[PDB]
Specification:
The complex is a heterodimer of chains A (231) and B (10). By secondary structure, chain A is mostly helical. Chain A has ten helices and three strands. Chain A has one domain. Chain A is 65% helix and 3% strand. In chain A, strand 2 (92-94) and strand 3 form a beta hairpin. Helices cover 70% and strands 0% of the residues of chain B. Chain B contains one helix and no strands. Chain B has one helix at residues 3-9. Chain B is elongated, with a radius of gyration of 5 Å. The A-B interface holds A 46, 49-50, 53, 63, 66-67, 70-71, 223-224, 227-228 and B 2-6, 8-9. The structure holds the ligand C[C@H](CCC(=O)O)[C@H]1CC[C@H]2[C@@H]3CC[C@@H]4C[C@@H](CC(C)(C)O)CC[C@]4(C)[C@H]3CC[C@]12C. Residues 23, 37-38, 40-41, 44, 78-79, 81-82, 85, 93, 95, 102, 107, 110-112, 204, 208, 211, 225, 229 of chain A line the site of the ligand C[C@H](CCC(=O)O)[C@H]1CC[C@H]2[C@@H]3CC[C@@H]4C[C@@H](CC(C)(C)O)CC[C@]4(C)[C@H]3CC[C@]12C. Chain A: It comes from Rattus norvegicus. Chain A: A motif (9aaTAD) lies at residues 223-231. Chain A: Residues 5-230 form the NR LBD domain. Chain A: Its main location: nucleus.
């Protein structure tokens, strides 16, 4: 049974998502797409921060814990939130028009190899196959951000208490509202997707470190990307 | 060390 509190949490996370996700940048053009896609990701980081600030209990963390959680999660949340614009019709992110339509070729021209891109595309396909409710999608984004196992977290106990309330809200939603048999081990498959995102984060960091030790490539980034993903 | 993040969090 979904408590008043649990429904309040879902309503809040749905509105936060609606306020910060909508399918100004340098134009789309092996690195030709890095200016455009670095701008897109930079913008997307700002929106992830916007979403995070509206997660019930996130405000009650120290500024230091908020920073470490957003630094560690930002790329995972961007990959995860991108699933809504992703289409299996052509393995592309279709943000409206052919201008802002991104296939394997496009996202392969921002200095990352198929060693990131191929798992990234397979992750989007896997996530489409789960066919999540938007309620489940936004809880998963919130659980992704507020995880007590991120490096540097000071108050793990408060982060864990917040993530446990979100997790309990998700498990309860799945049992009460997700149709069986689609609900069977759905919580476990969602947590596995979070593990896939940590793996994608690891591969991204490794490629980011290499790419961004080429100053000509670092030059094409944004100040926010350099602050969040590092120098 | 993260003034842009800090600013966006405010
Ligand atoms: C288009 C799509 C969002 C659509 C939506 O929101 O609805 C996003 C989500 C994940 C994004 C990719 C993440 C990894 C890197 C990050 C910087 C590169 C740096 C150098 C910062 O890592 C740019 C290249 C690349 C590959 C991105 C390409 C664009 C991707 C696929």
């Amino acid at each position: 049974k979904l408590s008043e509190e649990q429904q309040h949490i879902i309503a809040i996370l749905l509105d936060a998502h609606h306020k910060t996700y909508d399918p100004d940048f340098r134009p789309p053009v092996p690195l030709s797409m890095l200016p455009h896609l670095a701008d897109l990701v930079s913008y997307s980081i700002q929106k992830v921060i916007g979403f995070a600030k509206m997660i019930p209990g996130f405000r009650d963390l120290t500024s230091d814990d908020q920073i470490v959680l957003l630094k560690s999660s930002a790329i995972e949340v961007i990959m995860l939130r991108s699933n809504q614009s992703f289409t299996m019709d052509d393995m592309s992110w279709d943000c409206g028009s052919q201008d802002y339509k991104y296939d394997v070729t496009d996202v392969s021209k921002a200095g990352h190899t198929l060693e990131l891109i191929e798992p990234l595309i397979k992750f989007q396909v896997g996530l489409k196959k789960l066919n999540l409710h938007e309620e489940e999608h936004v809880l998963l984004m919130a659980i992704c951000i507020v995880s007590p196992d991120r490096p540097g977290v000071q108050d793990a106990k408060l982060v864990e208490a917040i993530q446990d309330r979100l997790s309990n809200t998700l498990q309860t939603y799945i049992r009460c509202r997700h149709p069986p048999p689609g609900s069977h081990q759905l919580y476990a498959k969602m947590i596995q997707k979070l593990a896939d995102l940590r793996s994608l984060n690891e591969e991204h960091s490794k490629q980011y470190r290499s790419l961004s030790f080429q100053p000509e490539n670092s030059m094409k980034l944004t100040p926010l990307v350099l602050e969040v993903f590092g120098n | 060390n993260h003034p842009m993040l800090m600013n966006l969090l405010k």
